[PDB]
Design a protein around this ligand. Structure first.
Ligand code: HEM
Lengths: 499, 499, 499, 499
C-alpha cells in the first residue's frame, strides 16, 4: 500500500470502474486510428504532412507552457471555505460578513517568492498565502503573506528589490553582493530581514504558518463610517518550522515537500484551518500613531490594538488538475467588494495596478473568464466586450454603450467608495528615513528569546559572509543601529568565517 | 418601422420586458457606484490609481482587438442544419450521411478575399463559403469558395499570390502592376481569372451563389472502398449577380450589404438554402482523365461526371454576438471525419497545415475550446494538456501519457487512413505548364455568349489598362493563347484606353 | 509615366541599376533551390513535412497580421522635422524649444477614427494628427486631432462612446440608434458634433487641415515657473474640405485618397508643413476662467489668449515600408520630457494610462524597441530587463537593481515634476452639467454664416433621420437648448425625411 | 578574493570606472527625477496615475517572463567557433567544411531535460548539447544530446513520453508510476534506460561529456553524391562523471553547478573543446545493414563504421546577458545548409516541424530576428513580411511576390535538394518491433565492466523500488528479456527494498 499522493492514478483507475475507455480523439474530436505510429510512405519512407493526427497533438504539445509568475512561481493550492463566527458588521457591511454561520467558498495558494517553477519549497524565503473569496458582491482577494511586514515601504523599489533577490543578469546565479548591497543600502528592510532570518524563516509545510493581509485596509459600515484595520489568520495546526539542517535535506529529497504534505493532509481527511482576526484603528487614532499607520514595514502592537475574531478558514478539496485550478489562478488585490477599501499605503496602492496588469500578460486579457478566476457567485454584467480567447456569450446582443435607453446594466450608487479629504502638494515624498529600527529593537530584545536571539545572528552571518567586505560593514553598521550587541554578535561570526 | 437588422436594440429591450437592469459590475463582479465619473482628489484634481473601476474597464477596451484573418477578413455568418435527402453510403461511411433525414448542426461563414476589416462587400473578388458540421465523429469543415477552381495549383505560390492581390509594401495602395505582373507570369491563372471578371465576379448578396469544394476529395465506404469526388452546394435562391454600376454604388452606399441582406433574410424567416451535390471518380478513370485530377485549375466535365444529390443546407439562425460567433469562427480543412480524406491535391495538401497553424496565432493555442469551435456533438479525450487560456477541466486528473495501464482513451482501428500506394522520385516537380488554356477556351467560347464575352473583356481591360505596357502585352499574349480574338478584343479597348 | 505612388516598383528597380538579384533564402538564411514547386513523392504524390522551405514561408504568411489600432485604425504616415523659429524658452525649458533654428526629427501619422483597416479615407469623422519628436530627453508624443475639443470630458465614457461609434454587437452594422442614443443622452457632445457635421467634417486630404493638442498642458521653465497652455499647428497649405458629394464618390473610387495624396505630394518635393503656435494662460487666470480650463469640450478664445509662434513642422520623407514604420508606429501622451507636463484634464489623465497599456498588447511588451518607436536620439539606461522579443543587449551585465553601489544609472534631480497643491475629498465629481451650450451657441451664430448653418443641419438631419423617433425628439431638444433656430431647422428637415 | 562568477558586478564597475554613471530614464528615454519615491498628493496621500515613471517601470516588470522551453528548461550557454582540421570535402559541399582551418562562429546551450526553470543541475537525466553554426549559407543547427540514442523511435510517442517524465496532472509531483508504467509498456527504451542509469547518467559539468547528433543524416558533395552519416563530438577535457551521493548533495549545495562550472572555466582562460567526428554508411551499405539504420534506439559500431575526424569545437566566450543570449537562443534542426539533409528517421522528421513551431510560440513569430538567432554570417532575402515585433526594415520597398519582373531575390537551382527515389504503400507502420535487446546486450556485457553493472542494477532498483509491484514485474521481464542475470540482479535488489 502507498500514500494518497503517489496513489493518484491508482484511485483514478479504480474510480473508472469497468466502463470501457473513451476514444482517443484528435483536437477536433475526430476518431484516431493509430497514434503510436507516424504516417509514412513505406516502412522507411518520409513523414507526410497528411498525418494531421501528428500535427494536431504535436502542435498542442509545443505550447503547453505559459510564463510562470514573475514572483511566487513555486507553490500549491487547495479549496475549502470561510465561515463567520463573529459579527463585525458594525465595522464593515461586506456581504462576506453577512451574519454568523455565513459560508463563502474559497481557493487558496501557498508559495515562496524568489524560486522558480523548478525550485524547492523547503528553503528560507517568505511565503505567499493568498485567499480568493467568491462573494455575492464579486470576488475578494486577500493576497496575503506569512508576515505582517515587508522589506520596503514604497512600490517603486519592489522590482529592484526582487531583482536583487534573484539571479545575476550575466551569470544567472544567485548573488549575495546583490542581495546584501540592496538590504544594506535600505535599512527599512531590517524589521523584515529580522523575521526572515528568525526561526520563522523556514516553516514546516504550509499548514503550520500564519497569514497576514500585511497592509492597513479600510472598513466601511453600512452607515458610511470608516475605520482602518489589519487582517490576521493564525494557524490552528499550530506553528512549526524546520531545522536549517533538515531544510537543505528535504530540499534535495522532496523539493515539493510543501505540496504533498498539504495535499495528503486533505486527502487523509486532515483539513487545515486558520482563524481570522483584525485590528481596528479609528481615523482619530491613526492621526495619533507615533508612526505611519500605513508604513508596510511596521506592525500594530497587539496590546494597543487587540485582535477580533471574525471567522474560520477551512481547506478540504484538493485540486483535480494542477495547471487548470492552481497554475492559472489569478489573485487581484484590487478585487475588493463593498465594505473593504485600500489605504494610502504607498505599496498597497501600487499593487492595485500591477496584479491585474501581469495577469493580462501571464494568462491573457480575458483571464477573469477562466473557471478558477471567474466570479461565479456573482453576476458579471457590464459594457466590456471581445478580446482574445473570448469564451462566454460575450454578453450577447446586449447594448454595449453606457448610458443607454435600452435597459442595459445600471450602476448601484450604494457601492460608492468612501469619501475622505486630502490636502497637500503633488510630489515624490521621501519615506526612506521613516524609522527603520525602533520596532526592530523591541523584536530583538523582547520577542526573541536569548536562545533564538543568537540563532538568528548565525543564520545571517552564514549568508552575509558571502558578500564583499565593504558590504559586510554597512550591514553590521545597520544591525548595530538596532542594537550594539546585534551587530556585535554578527560581526563575530563573520570575523571567524573570515579566518 | 424598419428592417429587423436596424431594429436590433429595440427588440432586445422588448425581450427584457419586466426584468429590471442588472447591476453594473467590474470584470471581478464588484458592483460600481458610478461608472460615469472618475475618482479624483477634488473636482479639478488628479486621477488616482485607486480608481480600479476605470482601469478595469479601460484595460479591457485596450485589448478588444485580435488579428483579422490574413485573407477573407470581411464576412458574415449564420447557423443552420444539414439534411440527408439521399443515401450515398455506397460511396462514403461518414456518419453525417449515416441516414436520410439525418440533420447535422452546421455553421457557415461567407466572405470576400482581399479586403480588410472595413472593406466593401460589393467588389470583384472570389467569395468564401465555409461550412462546419458538428458531427459525432468530431467536426467536418468544408472550407469552400464560390468558384470550383483557383488561380494556381501549387500552395507554394499562395503567399505570393495574396501579396500581389493586396497592398503595395511601401505605399500601402492597391497595385495593378503587382496584380497583373503575377497573373501575366502565371497563365495557369487564366481559368479563374476569366471566371472572375465574368458576371459571376460579383454576386448579389451571399444567398445568390453556389458553394464549391474545388479540391478533389476522398471517400471510403463502410467496406473501405476508396473513391474520389467533388462537392457542390448549388444555391436554391438562384444565381443572381450584381452589375458593375450598382456594386460601385453599394460600395459606398452600403459596404456591409451582404451582412445586412443575410441577417434580414433570416430575421424574416426567409432562410436561404443550397442543395449539396457531388461528383464521383475512380482511380481507374482517374489515371484515365486527360488532366491531373487534383489540379486546382480544372473542372470535372458534367457530361462525364454527373452531379449526385446528397442533402440540403438550410441557414435559419443568426448570430447573437458577432465576435464570439463569427469573428472567432475557425475552419480547418484537416477536420475530416472518417469517411472523408484528402487527395494528392498539391494545394489541398498545403491547407491541411495552414489553417490550424494560423488559428493557433489569430485566436490562440486553445482556440478549439472556444464555444463556437468546440466539437460538442462529440466528446474530446486524449493526452494533450495545458496551453494558454485553458478552460473546461483540462481532462481533470486523467493519465496524460499513452500508452498506459490505467484505463484512459484508446485507438480506433476502425478509423484508420485509407491506404493508397505511391511511388516515384522525391523532388519538386514543375507543374507550370499543365495546360492553362484548354478548359479556358471552352469556357470563353461555349460557356459565354457574345454579350458576356463583350463585358468580360472590358472588365479585364478596365483594370489591366493601369498596368505598365510591358505587363499589358505580356497579359495579352496569354489571352490570345486561349483565343486570338480573346486577346485582340481586350487589346482593342487597351489602345483606346491608352488613347 | 504615372504618379509616383504608381511607379513604386518601377523606381525600386531603377534604384538598383546594375546590381544583381540576391539569393532567395529561408528565414534562416538557408538558400532555396526552387521556391515555386512543392517537394512531393512522384508528380502526383503527397506533400512532405520534409519540405521545410514551404513550411518556413507558410508559417510566416500565417502570422503576418497584428491587431489593428483599437481606434484610428485607418491612417497614413510620414517623417519630417520640427524647426524652432521663435523663442518661447521663458515658458518651457524643453530642450526641443532650446534655441532658434533648432531642428528635431519627427514622425507623423494621420487617420480617421471609427473605421477599420479596409475603410475609406473620405468619411465624416475627426482626423488624428499624431506627432512624435525624437528629442534629447527622450521622445515627445503630441498626439493631437484635427479638432481642439472632443465629445466627452471624462475618460470613463470613452469606451462607451467608441462602442456606440462602431458596430452593433449582434449585427455588426453601423447603428444610428447607437450613435444618437448616446449623443442625445450626453449633451456635452454638442460642441464637437456641431463642428463634426460642419464643413470641416471631411477635409481635402491630410494636407489641408489644422492639428491641435486639444487638452491643456502645463509648461515649466528653468526656475520652475509653470503655465497652462494649448498647442495648435495650422496647415500652411490652407484649409480645404470636400463636398458631401465628392467624398461619397471618392469613397468607392479611391478609398485611400488621403494615403495617395500625401505620398505623392512628398514624392514630388511638395512637402506640406504646419506652423506651431501655443496658447498661454497663467495659473491666476485659470482660477478665474468662466469655465473649467481642463474641460475638453471647451476652447480658449483667441481674443483673450492669443496664439504664439513656436516653430514649423515639415514632412519631406515618405515611409519605406508601411508596416514597419507606420502600422507599428506608437505614440504615448506619457512621453513628455522635462519642461512639458500634463494638466488635471480628466480626459488627458486617463490617456496617460491607456496608450502604453494598449501598445503592450497590439505590439508587445518591448514595442519601445521597435526602430520607429525607439528614442534613438536619447540614451535609455534603466533597471528594466527582459520581456519577450527583447532586442539590443538588454543593457548587458549592468547592475539590475536600484539603489546599488556599482555605478549603474542614477536619477537626475533637475528632471523633477513641477509640484502643485491639491486638496479636496476623494470622490467621483459630476461633470455633466458643466455648460454644454454656451460655446456651441457662439459657434452656431458667429463662427458660421447662413450658407453653412444650412449645410450643417442638412448633414445632421441627413444622419439623424435614421434614429428612432423618440431619439430624434431627444436630440432635437438638445439643439434647441443651444438655439431655438438650431432645433427648428433640423426638425424641419426631419419632418421632411419622414415623408 | 573569489571566483569570476562571484566578482561579476565587481568587474563591471571596474571597467566602467573612470566614467560618470548614466542618467536613469524611462522606456521612452525621458530622464527620471527620482525613481525611489512615488508621486502622491501630500506625504500620506494616494498614488496618482500621473506617475508614469511608476507605471512604465512596473508595467515592464510585470512582463519580464516568457514561457520556458517545454523541455530542457534548465541549461547553460556559451559561444565559440568551429575549426576545420580535416577535409571531408568529398562528402558535403557544405561551406562550413569548405577548407582546413576554416573558422565558423558557434553558440552552444547545455541543459538537463525534464527539469523546470528552477530545477538543479546535477541530476540523473540526459543532457542537451546543442550547437548553432553561423555559416554564409545560413545557420546550421546541430541539436544534439549527450548520448547517441533515444528512448523512442516514433515522434508520436515523444509528447507522451515527456508527460511521464514530468509531474502528475493532479498532484504535480514527479511520479515513478508514470515513469515506469511508460517504460515497462515500451521496451524499446531499454537501451537508453541502461545508459541513463549508467555511470554517465550524471556528468561532472557540461565539460565532461560528449555531444551526439544522434539521428542518421545525409551528406551531399559537389557532385550530387550523398551518404548517411552520424555526428560525434567528444570532449577534450575527458569524460568525468559524478557519484550519486556527490550530485545528490550538490543538488542543494549548488543547484547551479553546471552554470558556475562552465562560466568560470571560460572566465579563467580554460576554454573547453570537443572534436567532431562523422560515421559514414553508403546507400548500399545502408541496405545490407542489419536492422533499421534510422532507428534512434540503435547505434553504428566504430568497428564496421569508423569515426572520421572533421574539426574542433572551442568555447571561449561567455554570455554578457543571459536572458538575451541563452534564454532567447533557439535552435532549429530544420536549419540545414546545402550539403546536409535529413534522413528518413521518423523521430528526426518529426523534429523538423516541432522546433520552429514551438519557437513561434515561446519566442514569437519573428524569433529569427532576435540578435543571437539571426543568420548574420549570411544575408536574408525573401518574400516574407510583417508579423509582430518586426525589426530591421521589413525588407524595405522590395517587391513582395514571386515570380516578379522587378529584379527581386531569385532562387538557386544549385541548392536543389538531393533526389532520393521512394516507393511503398502509405500508412502508419508499426515500429515496436526492431529488437529492443540486441545492441542492449552488447552493453550489459561488452561495453560495460562488471563493476558498473553492479551499481547500474542498483540504480534502476533505487528508483523503480517506488513503483507499483505489477509495474516492476513487467519492468524486470524486459530486463531479463535482455539477459536473465540482468532482470535477476534487479529482481533481487527489489524485494529487499520492500523491507
Ligand atoms: C521526435 C522527438 C522530439 C521532439 C518532438 C522534440 C521536441 C523538443 C522541443 C519542443 C523542444 C523545446 C524547444 C525550445 O523551446 O526551444 C526541444 C528541445 C531540445 N531537444 Fe528535443 N525533441 C525530440 C527529440 C530530441 C532528440 C533526438 C534530441 C537529440 C538529438 C533532442 C535534443 C534537444 C535539445 C538539446 C533541446 C534543447 C535546445 C535548447 O537548448 O534550446 N530532442 N525538443
Amino acid at each position: 500500500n502507498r500514500d494518497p499522493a503517489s496513489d493518484q492514478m491508482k484511485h483514478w483507475k479504480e474510480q473508472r470502474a469497468a466502463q470501457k475507455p473513451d476514444v482517443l480523439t484528435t483536437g477536433g474530436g475526430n476518431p484516431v486510428g493509430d497514434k503510436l505510429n507516424s504516417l509514412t510512405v513505406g516502412p522507411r519512407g518520409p513523414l507526410l504532412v497528411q498525418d494531421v493526427v501528428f500535427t494536431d497533438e504535436m502542435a498542442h504539445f509545443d505550447r503547453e507552457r505559459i510564463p510562470e509568475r514573475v514572483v511566487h512561481a513555486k507553490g500549491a493550492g487547495a479549496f475549502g471555505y470561510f465561515e463567520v463566527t463573529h459579527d463585525i458588521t458594525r465595522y464593515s457591511k461586506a456581504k462576506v460578513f453577512e451574519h454568523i454561520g455565513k459560508r463563502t467558498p474559497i481557493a487558496v495558494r501557498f508559495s515562496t517568492v524568489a524560486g522558480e517553477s523548478g525550485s524547492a519549497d523547503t528553503v528560507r524565503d517568505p511565503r505567499g498565502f493568498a485567499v480568493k473569496f467568491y462573494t455575492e458582491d464579486g470576488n475578494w482577494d486577500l493576497v496575503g503573506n506569512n508576515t505582517p511586514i515587508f522589506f520596503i515601504r514604497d512600490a517603486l523599489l519592489f522590482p529592484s528589490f526582487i531583482h536583487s533577490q534573484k539571479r545575476n543578469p550575466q551569470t544567472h546565479l544567485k548573488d549575495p553582493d546583490m542581495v546584501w548591497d540592496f538590504w544594506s543600502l535600505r535599512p527599512e528592510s531590517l524589521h523584515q530581514v529580522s523575521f526572515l532570518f528568525s526561526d520563522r524563516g523556514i516553516p514546516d509545510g504550509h499548514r503550520h504558518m500564519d497569514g497576514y493581509g500585511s497592509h492597513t485596509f479600510k472598513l466601511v459600515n453600512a452607515d458610511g463610517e470608516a475605520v482602518y484595520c489589519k487582517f490576521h489568520y493564525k494557524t490552528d495546526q499550530g506553528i512549526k518550522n524546520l531545522s536549517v539542517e533538515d531544510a537543505a535535506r528535504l530540499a534535495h529529497e522532496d523539493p515539493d515537500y510543501g505540496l504533498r504534505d498539504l495535499f495528503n493532509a486533505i486527502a487523509t481527511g486532515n483539513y487545515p484551518s486558520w482563524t481570522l482576526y483584525i485590528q481596528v484603528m479609528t481615523f482619530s487614532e491613526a492621526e495619533i500613531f507615533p508612526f505611519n499607520p500605513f508604513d508596510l514595514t511596521k506592525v500594530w502592537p497587539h496590546g494597543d490594538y487587540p485582535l477580533i475574531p471574525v471567522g474560520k478558514l477551512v481547506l478540504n478539496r484538493n485540486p483535480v488538475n494542477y495547471f487548470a485550478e492552481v497554475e492559472q489562478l489569478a489573485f487581484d488585490p484590487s478585487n475588493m467588494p463593498p465594505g473593504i477599501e485600500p489605504s494610502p499605503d504607498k505599496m498597497l496602492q501600487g499593487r492595485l495596478f500591477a496584479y491585474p496588469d501581469t495577469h493580462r500578460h501571464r494568462l491573457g486579457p480575458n483571464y477573469l473568464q477562466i473557471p478558477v478566476n471567474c466570479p461565479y457567485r456573482a453576476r458579471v454584467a457590464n459594457y466590456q466586450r471581445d478580446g482574445p480567447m473570448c469564451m462566454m456569450d460575450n454578453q450577447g446582443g446586449a447594448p454595449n454603450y453606457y448610458p443607454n435607453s435600452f435597459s442595459a446594466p445600471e450602476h448601484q450608487p450604494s457601492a460608492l467608495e468612501h469619501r475622505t479629504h486630502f490636502s497637500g502638494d503633488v510630489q515624490r515624498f521621501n519615506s526612506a528615513n521613516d524609522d527603520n529600527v525602533t520596532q526592530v529593537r523591541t523584536f530583538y530584545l523582547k520577542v526573541l528569546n536569548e536562545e533564538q536571539r543568537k540563532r538568528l545572528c548565525e543564520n545571517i552571518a552564514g549568508h552575509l559572509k558571502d558578500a564583499q567586505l565593504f558590504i559586510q560593514k554597512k550591514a553590521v553598521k545597520n544591525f548595530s543601529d538596532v542594537h550594539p550587541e546585534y551587530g556585535s554578535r554578527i560581526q563575530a561570526l563573520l570575523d571567524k568565517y573570515n579566518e
